[PDB]
Amino acid sequence: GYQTTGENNSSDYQGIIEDGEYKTSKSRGVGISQNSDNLLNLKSFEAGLTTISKDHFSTKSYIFQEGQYLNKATIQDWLGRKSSSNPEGLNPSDNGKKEANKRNPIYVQQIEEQDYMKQNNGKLELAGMTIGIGMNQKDYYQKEQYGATYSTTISKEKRIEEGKIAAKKVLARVRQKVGNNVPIVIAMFAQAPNDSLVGGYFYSYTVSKSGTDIGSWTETNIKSYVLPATEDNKLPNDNDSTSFDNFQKEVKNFFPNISNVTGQGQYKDKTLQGLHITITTQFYSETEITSFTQYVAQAAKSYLPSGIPVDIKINGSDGETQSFVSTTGGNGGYYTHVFGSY
Amino acid sequence: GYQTTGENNSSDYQGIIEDGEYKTSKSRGVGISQNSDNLLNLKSFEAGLTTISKDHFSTKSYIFQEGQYLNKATIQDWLGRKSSSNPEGLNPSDNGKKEANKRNPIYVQQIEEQDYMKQNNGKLELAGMTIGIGMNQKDYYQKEQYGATYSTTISKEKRIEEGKIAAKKVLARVRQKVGNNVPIVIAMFAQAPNDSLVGGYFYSYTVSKSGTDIGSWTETNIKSYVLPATEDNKLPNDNDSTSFDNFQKEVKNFFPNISNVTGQGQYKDKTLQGLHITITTQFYSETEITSFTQYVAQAAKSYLPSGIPVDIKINGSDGETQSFVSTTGGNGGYYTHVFGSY
Ligand SMILES: [Mg+2]
Ligand SMILES: [Mg+2]
Question: Which InterPro entries does the entry mention (chains A, B) (predicted)?
Answer without folding.
Answer: CamS (IPR011426)
